[PDB]
């Protein structure tokens, strides 16, 4: 018995071992009564303005959209502490953490941002953090690794399975399961068992929030439709959640490409991946004919993971959602337009919702349309695989 | 009917069960069905089998290289129903249990999986990541095609959870010994007696405490406490990496061990 | 003859060529006409909130200042778009080169930080970008020179001379005296000549400005001392500007020590240097017996210049403002305290201003004062820097 | 006084100006003193002396590299200072005029660089980076010491530079070909006379054209356009700069290039 529904339509549930159902029993509780408690939100909103750097900017983009009808501004999560979105929830899931008792920190990551995400955290408010990570992942990002160890994190490569991503997952929720009574684990994106995916919604749904007090002040009107990238989902449902009941704002998602979906290298599980049951919910997933969970890639390390939320595969199931795909190169072109256009280098991640903007706008230049793009982090982490790309392909 | 059968007659013997577990073609295909029929020749009373699988998060090490060199080796869920299939045209009385992770009951749909367990001859299925809670379909996919539901009591069980798994498992409770994942080198240093006591209450199918189980001691420890037997798994496989490079040692040492072990339930 | 006086005491003046005297008349009459101009200040403002990011937080850091009877705040223009505060008066640099019609902007960078923020700015408001950087510098900062390129600015390497940035301001002076009519010499520093020292200092005096409604929000009274470190001078004075009329608000600026000052390698030409003519200012400047412009030096490139803007010069003069130095090894040892405490990554420079705080706190524990440090930018771009010099010292 | 007896002389010849500019010690101190000797041998009427400085804001690459070369000659300034004492000794008529950054002459006091410059006969100073709106101290201390403030006439300029320039100039008036810094592949595009005339109008100091002068024609055209002469540097140090590996050969060119320039001040 839980106190909120785990399931959105079909997806989601708690498919955990049984050690572990107290740990999510408890985990929504403690969070069902901070959500009721005005000093949680106090404290939570005392760190997300103060040390954060909340409300983000929303910057009206005019020289991107020249000659056509399309009015683009970009959420500005870039300029959140940490260069991500990431901030925001694991500001909110420490604090959970120290609501429950708890003084130590379990954290995965593949790209590098959650880590860093999760050790700042824990480092500012006295947590010990450790952090599983890919073995591949750790030898690709070495300076994320060296940012969480600054900041005093224990970093602990995985070499079990394909020593990634959703390999660092498995053996996160394997220290959990001997571990809850004293660690909380700071699960990286709005997915996984109930309650992360709500509670990483409602820590990341003043993205939301703030763009639509932002737009109405600005244009005096509703954006015609909110764009995100998705990886596993958090920047994307904290755009969508406060536009949800607002039935004329789409709410577009976009999964990575990567080579192409016909390549079989990508990172849409949404779109073309499998319904399947890992990492405790039902969602869909990238996976073998045989139920083995596939590798998925894209250029962008912060997109790359099999599955995705569950309440993203529900708002596509009834129609509230739409979710599309962009390739590497659409991601990169977006990458450098954003740059010499605007002066605002992009997250690879944020380049692929930015892209299909730039679709949207290139493919009908005389529709008159609103666009909100969430800018979920900040580029500059990314120019070495952007130069590196355009050195070996002779553009430099 | 096999698991209700075999513990009455141990019952009858004053006996506890020893029930080893492997990961299904583990090194590969033939040394695992020579494992197998090791197992049972040295005095196994039941069977616990995994599938391969790619990321099996309630495993320790030792079970993940299982996991591991079965990959290696190609070992497909096909060819474990396969395996399953001659296992049980071997032993017509020893139970099989599988132990699965949810991914691969749910892929070709929940009720074909467990169709196709009764087709193999399989007695039960543990879903290692559906607790008791998200239980209702594999359940009820299991009863309808004769398998036992098997659901795990955590050392940590409320009452509540005490009764649901005594009112809806079937052939045996997967008795906890300790939190954590699988492996040999954690031993359970919580008693677990009064939990004996209520799933006896309550009328839950015979108790078989898992995790941890790797000496003789611990054996009759189990049996001493109230419980039907104890499950060893990553002491089994231990065995298996130790021995990767001799294939007939390997069988010996896996004979010594399964054999001291099962004299072990002998109260 | 000049609209302002060009002098802080004895110090500044314009000392250009003949022929960049009616460039410099030009940008101080229309400097002195946009400060009127409510226009002008409305686009400023709305390019400082809504793509600057403006306000940034002001931090309160209580894990820092434990068992101490220190409070600790730091100003976040780490926060501000492109990571440091110099994104502020490039961008009013900008609009008062389109007020003027220009179109092109010339800058020299050294670190590489102000080539970016004048390439981002130059981007945004359409103005064709051309970046001097001394050589020695291009290939010290591969990643800015990237940056800059992203954003579409022409970056033109300087051999003459030292190969650095007195060579870059050199060659930047040189194509402005055959070029002022249709270019803006966008200057990244309060240095150089009238009026530059003042239209960069008015262009980041929100800064302080902020600060002093933030504490006085937050504690109720001004600070004790405002802290900032001090290569060309910009980023200090922002922060001392709206201070300065209160007398009892202390103002300590920090010049880097560099391996020490006993070595002659250091940065700190304001309390060790010797005043000279050069640049298109008098100030105090590192120089040898002979009038040589020498050589500085420091673990941070921001901070590395032989000379000091003219109004620190004067406010040291009078007593109203204080300079310090702090070594190579100070710094790294504040860059690591912040991370590991407060989970903010620290720019290099900038660790030079936290590390006197952290000395005013530990050698005077009981001592009760309010400080706030400057931080004026981020440290993500120092992480390579750090982690090879921790490796040399066996330190990882 | 030397300025005055030269274009006195000059205009009693119907003649113009020629004077060549070189940095001091470039490429050593002694070919320096032979360059200068060659310049004054072929008809140079006076001379333009440049002190090595680090930080040259106001030269193209020509003369980047003449105080580049003189920099890696070790050429301080304390040796400028005894080249001048010679060449004042060997040439008792010919005006000598310094180009100074201000750094050099601020260094060891501004009133001790020009009582320096009075000592070994200096006649004239022009200091590239202070304008006439910062020249006050830099003038006053050059006519204490008997020498003339060089004040720049740029193309651009209004009348209220032409009059500061005229009632504070002394010697000669730089008349700034064009914009820009030093070099002479860039020559001035713009018709001076008006401001020649302007300056004769305020009974200026004589003017000699600078920037871009490189050949006959435009020593030529500065005279018949009311200039009293022409300055030419970087088309000396060009020279200098291309004949590095023979400095017999450099001479030889330096002696036939300032002739020729000599040769078109003849009205
Ligand atoms: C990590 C990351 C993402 C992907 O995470 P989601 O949960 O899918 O939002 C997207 N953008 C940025 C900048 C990220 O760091
Ligand atoms: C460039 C820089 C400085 C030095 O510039 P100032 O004009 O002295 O302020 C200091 N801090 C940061 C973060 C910088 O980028
Ligand atoms: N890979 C990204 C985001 C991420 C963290 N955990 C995840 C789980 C699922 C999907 C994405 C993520 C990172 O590590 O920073
Ligand atoms: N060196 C730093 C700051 C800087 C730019 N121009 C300067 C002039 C003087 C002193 C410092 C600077 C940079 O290039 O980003
Ligand atoms: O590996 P151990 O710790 O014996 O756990 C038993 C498990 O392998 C089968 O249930
Ligand atoms: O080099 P040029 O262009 O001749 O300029 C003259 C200058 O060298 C002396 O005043
Ligand atoms: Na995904
Ligand atoms: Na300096």
């Given at each position: 018995t839980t106190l909120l529904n785990p399931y959105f339509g079909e997806f989601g549930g708690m498919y955990v071992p049984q050690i572990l159902m107290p740990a999510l029993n408890q985990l929504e509780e403690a969070f069902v009564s901070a959500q009721k408690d005005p000093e949680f939100q106090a404290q939570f909103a005392d760190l997300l303005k103060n040390y954060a750097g909340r409300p983000t900017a929303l910057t009206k983009c005019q020289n991107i959209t020249a000659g056509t009808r399309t009015t683009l501004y970009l959420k500005r999560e870039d300029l959140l502490h940490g260069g991500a979105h990431k901030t925001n929830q694991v500001l909110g899931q420490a604090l959970l953490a120290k609501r429950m008792g708890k003084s130590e920190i379990i954290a995965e990551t593949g790209a590098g941002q959650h880590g860093v995400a999760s050790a700042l955290a824990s480092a500012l408010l006295g947590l010990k953090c450790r952090i599983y990570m890919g073995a591949k992942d750790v030898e690709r990002q070495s300076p994320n690794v060296f940012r969480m160890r600054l900041m005093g994190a224990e970093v602990i490569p995985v070499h079990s399975g394909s020593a990634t991503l959703k390999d660092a997952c498995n053996e996160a929720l394997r220290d959990w399961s001997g571990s809850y009574e004293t660690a909380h684990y700071m699960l990286?994106?709005?997915?996984?068992?109930?309650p992360y995916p709500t509670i990483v919604r409602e820590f990341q749904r003043m993205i939301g929030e703030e763009t639509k007090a932002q737009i109405l002040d600005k244009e005096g009107r509703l954006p015609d439709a909110v764009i995100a990238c998705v990886g596993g989902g958090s920047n994307a449902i904290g755009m969508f959640a406060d536009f949800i009941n607002d039935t004329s704002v789409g709410l577009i998602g976009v999964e990575p490409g990567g080579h192409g979906i016909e390549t079989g290298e990508h990172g849409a599980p949404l779109k073309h991946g499998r319904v399947g049951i890992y990492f405790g919910m039902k969602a869909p997933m990238m996976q073998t004919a045989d139920g083995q969970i596939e590798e998925s890639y894209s250029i962008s390390a912060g997109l790359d993971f099999p599955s995705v939320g569950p309440q993203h595969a529900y708002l596509n199931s009834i129609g509230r959602a739409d979710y599309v795909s962009i390739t590497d190169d659409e991601a990169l072109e977006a990458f450098k337009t954003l740059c010499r256009h605007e002066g605002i280098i992009p997250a690879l991640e944020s380049s692929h919702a930015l892209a299909h903007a730039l679709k949207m706008m290139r493919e009908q230049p005389e529709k008159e349309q609103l666009l909100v793009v969430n800018?979920?982090?900040?580029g500059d982490k990314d120019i070495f695989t952007v130069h590196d790309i355009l050195k070996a392909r002779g553009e430099i | 009917e096999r698991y209700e059968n075999l513990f009455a007659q141990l019952n009858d013997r004053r006996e506890g069960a020893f029930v080893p577990f492997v990961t299904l073609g583990d090194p590969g295909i033939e040394q695992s069905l020579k494992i197998i029929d090791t197992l049972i020749d040295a005095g196994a009373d039941a069977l616990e089998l995994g599938v391969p699988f790619?990321?099996?998060?309630?495993?320790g090490p030792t079970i993940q290289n299982a996991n591991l060199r079965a990959f290696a080796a190609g070992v497909t869920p096909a060819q474990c129903f396969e395996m399953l299939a001659l296992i049980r045209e071997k032993h017509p009385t020893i139970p099989i249990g599988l132990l699965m992770y949810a991914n691969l009951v749910f892929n070709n749909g929940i009720d074909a999986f467990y169709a196709r367990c009764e087709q193999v001859g399989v007695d039960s299925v543990l879903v290692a990541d559906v607790p008791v809670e998200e239980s209702a379909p594999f359940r009820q996919a299991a009863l309808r095609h004769n398998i036992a539901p098997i659901f795990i009591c955590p050392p940590n069980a409320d009452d509540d959870l005490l009764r649901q798994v005594a009112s809806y498992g079937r052939g045996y409770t997967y008795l906890l010994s300790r939190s954590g994942v699988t492996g040999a080198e954690n031993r359970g240093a919580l008693p677990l007696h009064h939990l004996i006591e209520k799933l006896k209450e309550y009328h839950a199918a015979p108790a078989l405490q898992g995790f941890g189980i790797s000496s003789p001691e611990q054996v009759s420890a189990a049996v001493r406490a109230g419980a039907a037997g104890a499950i060893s798994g990553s002491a089994i496989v231990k065995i298996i990496e130790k021995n990767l490079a001799s294939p007939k040692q390997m069988l010996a040492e896996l004979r010594s061990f399964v054999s001291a072990m099962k004299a072990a339930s002998r109260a």
């Open positions: 990286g994106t709005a997915a996984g068992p109930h800018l979920s982090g900040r | 790619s990321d099996p998060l309630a495993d």
